[PDB]
Design a protein around this ligand. Structure first.
Ligand SMILES: [Ca+2]
Length: 230
């Protein structure tokens, strides 16, 4: 996360750090269920039995001896996924045991696809920077699909992608190692709800280039339905 600050212990307790040992990937994710992690499709190489991914939960400090590290058993990657710029950027990871933390509810309508979001992760705080020890967080405003394209010239799958950040100035964004983490905000009951998954962009926090996130509301019923088979 670029332009952010340290999250407090317990602030976003649904956050997990993913290490895909097989392909050397470092990613974020959210506890969709205590034993099912919602992350990006591009964080995994496909669907099936997979015991190569590790989820670290419970802690903002990844070197903490309170950390809970649990291994995957199974991955379900969005059907038809090919690359994150073409959409469908979601996957579920079934864990061998639950991580005993609050879960993050996901948006199932577009009602919350606006306003000011929060993102969090342990990715770099600058382009080419290294990974973070402590979870970082930042607020990024919704950028309309139209405002996103005009500065960017990004080609969006509009219903599958939500943009966020400060295209006029840059300065705040998710970055390498944040992929798969949730983008979220408060709902009407003052509870956290997930509207995005950190998906892609062009560098990090560059003027003209907002971050692009998987638009969760579009995929919520396919996600819920896939999680039930897990
Ligand atoms: Ca959109």
């Amino acid at each position: 996360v670029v332009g952010g600050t340290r999250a407090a212990q317990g602030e976003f307790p649904f956050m997990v750090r993913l290490i895909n040992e097989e392909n050397e990937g470092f990613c974020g994710g959210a506890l969709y269920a205590q034993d099912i992690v919602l992350t990006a499709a591009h964080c995994v190489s496909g669907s099936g039995n997979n015991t190569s991914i590790t989820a670290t939960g419970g802690v903002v400090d990844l070197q903490s001896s309170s950390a809970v590290k649990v291994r995957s058993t199974k991955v379900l990657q969005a059907p038809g996924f090919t690359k994150e710029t073409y959409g469908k950027d979601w996957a579920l990871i079934k864990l061998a045991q639950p991580i005993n933390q609050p879960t993050l509810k996901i948006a199932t309508t577009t009602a919350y696809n606006q306003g000011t979001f929060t993102v969090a992760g342990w990715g770099a705080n600058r382009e080419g920077g290294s990974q973070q020890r402590y979870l970082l967080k930042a607020n990024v405003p919704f950028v309309s699909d139209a405002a996103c394209r005009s500065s960017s010239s990004f080609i969006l799958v509009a219903n599958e992608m939500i943009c966020a950040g400060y295209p006029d100035t840059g300065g705040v964004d998710t970055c390498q190692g944040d992929s798969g983490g949730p983008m979220f905000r408060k709902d009407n009951a003052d509870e956290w709800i997930q509207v995005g998954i950190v998906s892609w962009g062009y560098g990090c926090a560059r003027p003209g280039y907002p971050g692009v996130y998987t638009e969760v509301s579009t995929f919520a019923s396919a996600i819920a339905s896939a999680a039930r088979t897990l």
